[PDB]
Amino acid sequence: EVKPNPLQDANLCSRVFFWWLNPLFKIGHKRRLEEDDMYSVLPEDRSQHLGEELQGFWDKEVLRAENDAQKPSLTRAIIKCYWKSYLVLGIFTLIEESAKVIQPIFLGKIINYFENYDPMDSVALNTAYAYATVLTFCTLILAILHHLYFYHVQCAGMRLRVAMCHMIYRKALRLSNMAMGKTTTGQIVNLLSNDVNKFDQVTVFLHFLWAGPLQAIAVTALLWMEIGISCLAGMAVLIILLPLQSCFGKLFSSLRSKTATFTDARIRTMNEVITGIRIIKMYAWEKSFSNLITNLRKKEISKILRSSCLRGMNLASFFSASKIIVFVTFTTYVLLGSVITASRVFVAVTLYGAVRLTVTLFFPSAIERVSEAIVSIRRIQTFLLLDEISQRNKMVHVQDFTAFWDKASETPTLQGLSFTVRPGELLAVVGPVGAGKSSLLSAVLGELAPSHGLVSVHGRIAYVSQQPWVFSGTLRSNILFGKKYEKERYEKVIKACALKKDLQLLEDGDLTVIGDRGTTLSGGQKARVNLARAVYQDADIYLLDDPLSAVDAEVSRHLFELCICQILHEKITILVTHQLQYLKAASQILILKDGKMVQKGTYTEFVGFQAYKNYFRAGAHWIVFIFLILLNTAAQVAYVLQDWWLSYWANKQSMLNEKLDLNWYLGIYSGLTVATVLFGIARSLLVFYVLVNSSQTLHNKMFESILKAPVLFFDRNPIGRILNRFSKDIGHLDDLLPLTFLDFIQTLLQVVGVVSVAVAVIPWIAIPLVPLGIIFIFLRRYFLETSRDVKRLESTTRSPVFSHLSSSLQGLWTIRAYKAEERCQELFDAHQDLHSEAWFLFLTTSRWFAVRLDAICAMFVIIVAFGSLILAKTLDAGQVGLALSYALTLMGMFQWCVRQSAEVENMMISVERVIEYTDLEKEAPWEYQKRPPPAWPHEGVIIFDNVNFMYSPGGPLVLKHLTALIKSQEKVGIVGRTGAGKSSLISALFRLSEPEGKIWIDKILTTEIGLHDLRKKMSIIPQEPVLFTGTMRKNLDPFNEHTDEELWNALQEVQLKETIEDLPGKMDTELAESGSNFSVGQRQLVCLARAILRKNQILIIDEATANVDPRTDELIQKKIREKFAHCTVLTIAHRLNTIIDSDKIMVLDSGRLKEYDEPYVLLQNKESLFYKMVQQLGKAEAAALTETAKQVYFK
Ligand SMILES: CN(Cc1cnc2nc(N)nc(N)c2n1)c1ccc(C(=O)N[C@@H](CCC(=O)O)C(=O)O)cc1
């Protein structure tokens, strides 16, 4: 292999510690890794090998099933070939679990030493060191050897996932055409992308479906030896935590599903704002959508907050459950008439610490994951059983042929069909239109099968489809398509396909990589690509669909005149083209109508601390975080002081031979338990409140920024980029970041609690702990700066796998036509076994960190266990029991604390990306203090004076020195060349970018007044209409100033009234999304209604009606002239008859006012560009317009 893998040769002492992985980090610490630096997978894990294992068992299972006449199931096959070897990892699960229940038994015997401490008894001390020794080995088993096991049970999921993806692909080639009607690309790619992805998860915990239950028995049996019948009270309070956890699971999932409606409703409404942001600004409707989204967000936070506070009680249960389970036991243990003893309780405290995770976390997660992963296997089992293409098998012969696309009541798609063609014979075909024209050709391939009659084909086949097809690779490779690079034949076809020049001139030659999903090439090349691919095959048979040759062009000739008519003419070619004049090339022409063969004759028949503090201080006043810090510490100090109190009671009890007053010692105990639950609850609710309240504040500050952003911003950023921040980023900020942040903080205090009791009880342990702190923080940087790349490579290598499946599935007939399936099969393995290289690093790099990180806290357990026995003279039974019963938890929590530190610091990028918009550069204020007088714009005088306009500041001048007088109520036609002037005159007049010079409206300086003063008083009919998702009333008047009778008047005048009055809600009918229930012309009629309602003294037409059919265009042109006769009107137009009667016309070119006069006075100057443009009409209509103009102005 090109990339050797050290795991093939590592000695066991190396691949237990992942010592073999160190060379990857020395690279990644110097350089950002690349896909060439990753190790190749083991021979055991190559996709080709896994597929041809499991496919064999699945084949046997299908064969067995039909012999039994009992339904096959895939879940038997993926067992019968992993049962052999996944159960081996089950054996090593025992010693992993047995460690968790043997440390507490030796933990008793070390504490039992201090209860019986004799300074001079060397034998007891040496005996205690026996128990202390095995306590580290039970710890090192659980900390070090566990990570080799846990790597292998993740690998058993990778091996299964790639075996499945390979069988899905092996099937997805051979799906019958029938099954291709049932399925769709999105469904089969969902198997690869969504469903088989579950098989990494199922295999991790799967052993807990037995080892977990067995362990819960084991801990109960031990405790019954240790603390008697009270253990049943403890275990019961643990077991009844299963249904409560399940109740929460259902309940917050229920609220989650509810929020998804408003999240979807917000985002889709947000999508309209970002798409239409130009049109929304022009109408000054920014206040409306501000209110509309604001009410959707309030209806969402009222449920996100309610669910999040519900998750607060959940996390408080994970925190506080151990303290409650302990409390009810020891309370019961004393109330049943017994006395606490430090050994007997720190054994029992530790055992609940072991079994709690298994019963509440791993065993329920195992049941959940296996439940949903078997949903996946049942979907895949449904897919594998789809019906599949039957075996097909210089000459083609077809007789009496009749077939259907499916067995149905529709007529046969081919009828009576028969023909024969032989070497030297060319066929051509004429047939249906607007239908599966290819149907005959597909029949010759066998993508449709005869219902009656016969087809036989004896040569190797080549084929082309009206849809071009190209897949992952170089353009050359698509042409070579698995054959050798025979340069002369290649050059001959590359010449004959008129490809050479265009390929080198436009796509840098055949070495160019074809972009993903084929995005690189132009269609006319991609068309030629198919023919070039086809003719390169040197097959015998050439079934040629039309290569989009319907354009009259030299290529559309040369491909036929040379390559077909001279080179290919001897080959068995069957040709379709709209260029039917070429049919004279045929030896025989098949002519069909509606799928009936009718004629057969020849032609002769014719992130950093700055980000965190902005996120936090947006959430609450800094004093609230001071109060939060007390709740964090007070929750934890209650948590530790509960267990210190249990140890203190043991010291008092063990100083007695009188009796302790249980009404006191249980009194304070229950206070500390109730305190730790209450502060455990109150912490979790408070953090969720403060952080969710931040997300509400960041959104509302950020959305108001988007509206005030200038149109330049939405030109600079594509709408997908902007909306994504409202979808994902301001999603995380309340869906998941508060939950992850609390989970980190909650556990981080747990770890600090462990080192605190350890250092408080054994004071010197701070001295070696400082190296451990110094070692850890060095290692986190050394790791994460390379782990971050492996996370990135794993994602970047994912999407080609699906891209190849999608691309292949879009082109199946072309693949099968050459029978070249195993070529596109092996190319999937080269994609699959490249993601497995990036995934194999994802597993083992996380395991490398977790091994070294657990060496730190396995050393800590060593330091406390031996440190206590070295320092035994000073210690006491209780305090050692405290220190150890805590320290033995540490290697559980510390991994999770550090894991969540990477999720938060990673997810914090969504905070910085949102904040990047929170201060985006604003437009000028919507409403300056110098509001225009109540003598509002009234005359409609508009002055342009030296107007110079650029879209970007310092960009090219799109208008230069533009200076014009438009008198009151004048009608002005505006004309320009393609791209010259255009709507840019409007963008200035609405100040969508800042004009230099001055524009006056009734001698009001437009740059002084607020944009909502300016944009309300003028009005526009924009180039494309938009109907927003909402009521017809809101599409007419979202401020609801007008009566519906007046809305009926407006809808009447655009003649939409009765169509809208027929709607089931009349004015209050909510439109379909983007108003798809109305055609483009109807939407423009709505745009006219908006102006008709507002009755502005200035109207602007943005060339829009050129998109509209003449009958509605006439109605628009009519109603404008009748309703806005007193208005000043600007008419950007192309079709000069729309403006030939304008009191003046402006002609703009190159951003300059080339003509400005009465149109005929321009036509009177035959040198004028307006006269030239009128003559460039090229028809006597120029005279009719000239006479029309003349009459208007001579009158
Ligand atoms: C103490 N603690 C906090 C925590 C978080 N969520 C919970 N959720 C439940 N239902 N119950 C809990 N006790 C619980 N506890 C922990 C402890 C260990 C691991 C943990 O080790 N998780 C591993 C298990 C594998 C391993 O690393 O050993 C994983 O799959 O990520 C997580 C959280």
From Swiss-Prot:
Q: State the EC number(s).
A: 7.6.2.-, 7.6.2.2, 7.6.2.3
PTM comment text: N-glycosylated; leading to substrate-selective effects on its transport activity.
What membrane topology does the annotation report for this chain? Multi-pass membrane protein
Q: What SUPFAM superfamilies does UniProt report for this protein, alphabetically?
A: ABC transporter transmembrane region, P-loop containing nucleoside triphosphate hydrolases
Transmembrane domains' residue ranges:
87-107, 130-150, 201-221, 222-242, 322-342, 345-365, 426-446, 621-641, 672-692, 737-757, 759-779, 855-875, 878-898, 939-959
Keyword list (alphabetical) reads: ATP-binding, Cell membrane, Glycoprotein, Lipid transport, Membrane, Nucleotide-binding, Phosphoprotein, Repeat, Translocase, Transmembrane, Transmembrane helix, Transport
Q: Which GO terms describe its biological process?
A: bile acid and bile salt transport; cAMP transport; cilium assembly; export across plasma membrane; leukotriene transport; platelet degranulation; prostaglandin secretion; prostaglandin transport
The effect annotated for residue 181 to W is: Transport properties comparable to wild-type
Names of required cofactors: Mg(2+)
Q: What is this protein called?
A: ATP-binding cassette sub-family C member 4
Species in which this protein is naturally found: Homo sapiens
